[PDB]
């Protein structure tokens, strides 16, 4: 802790060696003990401005980052016959209600006092739990719970075959067939497409699955009323048989073209009377039919920041898909520009999620093969909800005015999410429409109305309570630097589509500049408060991410996927991608998270992202959230190389070392343990590379050292001075 000031120039080691923790809002003990999981709901400002004004001169942005479907340990689920909520605002009974009569409760959002219907009422579960799940009654659904419908759509073009992904996808689909979420109603489909759209029937009536082509690309339809979307249970061996088949159907196609548009318009029609999850797999620019996407040309490092989609089609289709509870997930596996700027708009507006495997090849690039493999195991076994809808309620005087994530904002600001991803993030900007005079406490709550694999309507409600402060300095004291950088990123991505990449990169500096220029005028060098002692560092990391960097050889589909992941990944994983956690893993000692009965697991200090913290006589590991990496020292100790690498000298390491052998030395079990602990702090299984040597063609590890200078960007010290000089103009 500490109200203290910080001079970012003199210290320069400002980052903790321990992982950073959320800030605890300055809130009464008995209230804070009920506040919900900060990794499920968290404001940029724990301490809430009272006047739009006051907010306006911290030049910090008021907003919320939520992660509503996070897989929980303990989730209380109340089957209350009747559900008690606000008789106006329609808010759910938060524990941050003020009870007054034991017969009346004081709504903490729109200030109306309600009667608790004949149903120690203060310690009922709806009030002892901030993260609760309700069992919605009959009035909360337009139709009976939909069955789970997972249709899969493959590209099988010439390029598609050369990549060879259809072999891994189909073995994944086989190995997780019983693990697909649903009960005996789980429906499943299959579609492939080159210049033509291919349906597959499945009846136990003939021996073979039937392949039904549609060739009217300018007018598509369905060729069979049944057996195209089959019950998995009874038709399992017929689905299995097809998956051992499909990878072998095209091994000699000379189709260069891909009618994505048509394929998809059909794929939507197929499931449109139920909705479900359309899993779409794609490998090249779509050049045939509607969705025609002219080729473009990648910008080299010599270009100036000078982003948008090419056609409305991919968006308008995603709206239709939404309107029918259809969600589209874009698995891009391309090796050339595919106009993901246009393609992504399929998962953006339909509660989807995008997956990018640049230059996929089942030989020439075994990294992605092991990534795609793992990521799919997640995409296939992870809990799923259907025909979901979400509303975010904040207390009177605040107003939500802007939404970030994968969904469609319908009238009355209803986040229509056709499907709820358990690893998808969402974010929101609020503002003070009416000043917070009468209130010392504001609360936010979001409700997730969804349908579970087991066909039961549920509502997930998280509630959050925060103080209201009235001075500049008490606004800064509970600023949330991570949550601010996250909100700023989602904010800047629109900025770069609304305007220009330079204008994106601009507010991002001006977010620091305009903020500390306003705090210095609220009290020699660069003064910040403790809570913002990392705001200039992370924002640098922002500017240096693949999404925002300039002077680099970055390609369009990469940076677009980089932004796509900003708007859709939760906070913790955006942080990890931006500012990876780097570890001294040559000498693992023992001041570490042992306890866990028989394990080791040191917590070597989280190292600052610089070269000068490296050392060529060791071997360092870099957590990028979605992947791990291990730099190895040219001049390193052999002891390492011979006991955890099992290699006599650093010259004899296989270049794509997929993962460490499980050797037999306390030094091996070590860096296995510390990696495994790193793997179980996420459900996403991250791949690990030793590949870093000194020239093994993989020196991106070096672009994450986001404190060092380049032929293209400042250094952190360099960045600190551009700030100060502009703080003091």
């Amino acid at each position: 802790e500490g109200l203290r000031v910080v001079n970012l120039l003199q210290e320069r080691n400002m980052l903790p060696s321990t992982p950073l923790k959320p800030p605890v809002p300055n809130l009464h003990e008995d209230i804070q003990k009920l506040n919900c999981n900060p990794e499920l709901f968290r404001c940029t400002l724990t301490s809430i401005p009272q006047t739009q004004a006051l907010l306006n001169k911290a030049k910090l942005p008021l907003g919320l980052l939520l992660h509503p479907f996070k897989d929980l340990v303990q989730l209380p689920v109340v089957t209350s016959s009747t559900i008690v909520r606000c008789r106006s605002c329609r808010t759910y009974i938060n524990p941050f209600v003020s009870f007054l009569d034991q017969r009346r409760w004081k709504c903490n959002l729109c200030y109306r006092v309600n009667d608790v219907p004949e149903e120690e009422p203060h310690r009922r579960p709806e009030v002892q739990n901030a993260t609760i799940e309700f069992m919605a009654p009959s009035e909360y659904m337009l139709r009976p719970p939909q069955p789970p419908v997972y249709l899969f759509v493959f590209d099988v073009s010439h390029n598609a075959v050369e990549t060879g992904y259809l072999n891994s996808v189909c073995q994944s689909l086989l190995d997780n067939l019983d693990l697909l979420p649903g009960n005996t109603r789980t429906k499943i489909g299959f579609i492939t497409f080159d210049s033509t759209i291919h349906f597959y029937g499945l009846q136990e009536s003939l021996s073979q699955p039937q392949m039904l082509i549609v060739s009217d690309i300018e007018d598509v339809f369905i060729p069979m009323p049944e057996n195209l979307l089959v019950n998995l249970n009874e038709s399992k061996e017929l689905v299995q048989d097809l998956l051992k088949t499909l990878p072998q159907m095209f091994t000699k196609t000379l189709e260069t073209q891909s009618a994505l548009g048509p394929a998809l318009q059909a794929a939507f029609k197929l499931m449109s009377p139920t909705g479900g999850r359309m899993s779409v797999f794609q490998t090249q620019l779509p050049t045939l039919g509607v969705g025609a996407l002219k080729p473009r040309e990648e910008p080299n490092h010599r270009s100036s920041a000078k982003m948008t989609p090419s056609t409305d089609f991919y968006k308008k289709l995603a709206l239709d898909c939404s309107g029918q509870q259809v969600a589209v997930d874009l698995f891009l596996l391309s090796g050339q520009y595919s106009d993901l700027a246009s393609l992504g708009c399929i998962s953006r507006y339909s509660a989807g999620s995008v997956y990018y495997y640049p230059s996929y090849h089942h030989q020439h690039n075994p990294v992605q093969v092991q990534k795609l493999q793992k990521e799919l195991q997640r995409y296939l076994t992870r809990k799923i909800g259907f025909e979901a809808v979400m509303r975010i309620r904040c207390t009177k005087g605040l107003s939500i005015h802007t939404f970030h994530g994968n969904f469609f904002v319908r009238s009355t600001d209803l986040l229509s999410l056709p499907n709820v991803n358990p690893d998808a993030g969402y974010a929101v900007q609020m503002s003070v429409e009416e000043s917070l005079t009468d209130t010392q406490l504001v609360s936010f709550q979001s409700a997730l109305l969804y349908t579970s694999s087991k066909g039961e309507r549920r509502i997930r409600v998280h509630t959050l309570c925060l103080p209201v402060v009235s001075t500049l300095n008490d606004v800064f004291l509970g600023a949330d630097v991570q949550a601010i950088s996250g909100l700023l990123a989602n904010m800047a991505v629109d900025r770069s589509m609304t305007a220009s990449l330079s204008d994106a990169r601009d507010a991002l500096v001006n977010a620091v500049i305009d903020s500390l220029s306003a705090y210095r005028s609220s009290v020699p060098g660069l003064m910040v408060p403790f809570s913002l002692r990392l705001f200039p560092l992370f924002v640098l990391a922002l500017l240096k991410q693949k999404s925002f960097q300039t002077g680099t050889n970055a390609r369009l589909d990469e940076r677009i996927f980089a932004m796509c992941q900003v708007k859709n990944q939760p906070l913790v994983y955006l942080m990890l991608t931006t500012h990876p956690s780097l570890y001294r893993v040559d000498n693992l000692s023992d001041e570490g998270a042992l306890n866990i009965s028989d394990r080791t697991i040191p917590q070597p200090p989280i190292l600052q992202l610089s070269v000068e913290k490296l050392s060529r006589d060791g071997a360092f590991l870099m957590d990028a959230g979605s992947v791990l990496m291990l730099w190895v020292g040219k001049n390193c100790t052999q002891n390492f190389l011979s006991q955890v690498l099992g290699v006599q000298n650093y010259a004899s390491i296989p270049q794509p070392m997929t993962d460490l052998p499980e050797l037999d030395t306390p030094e091996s079990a070590r860096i296995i343990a510390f990696i495994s602990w790193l793997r179980e702090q996420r459900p996403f299984f991250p791949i690990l590379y030793v590949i870093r040597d000194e020239s093994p063609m993989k020196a991106n590890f070096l672009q994450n050292m986001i404190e060092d200078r380049t032929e293209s960007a400042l250094s952190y010290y360099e960045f600190l001075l551009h700030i100060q000089q502009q703080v003091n103009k």
């Binding site: 009959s138 139709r143 009960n183 029609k269 039961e456």
Partner: protein
Amino acid sequence: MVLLTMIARVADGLPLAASMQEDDLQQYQSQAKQLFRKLNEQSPTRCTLEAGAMTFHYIIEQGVCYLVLCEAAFPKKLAFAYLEDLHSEFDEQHGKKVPTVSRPYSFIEFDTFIQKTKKLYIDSRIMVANIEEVL
């Protein structure tokens, strides 16, 4: 030739099992939900109701209502030949538990059996009244 089946509890009206399929269902599944509420211990044990282009067809047994809705025309005395095979399987498999449950659609997995019996009725190979009266 075109359907809309619903099974609900005659008491509260809690729906138990349905079958729907499209390629409208909005207004038409309403009245069924409001019919379900009305039905009590005097309601006719079998009754046919009538509505412009469509028609309702329900029995009541063991305290559970087996309603089906069809676009007029469709064979009257055949409709009840479905719900007899339905009520067979419901009272057979789930009859015991119907007054114990309370989550809506607690027997949704019964959708899987409605459909194979629903269709084995579309390809060829009692009291009368008007819907707007009871409601």
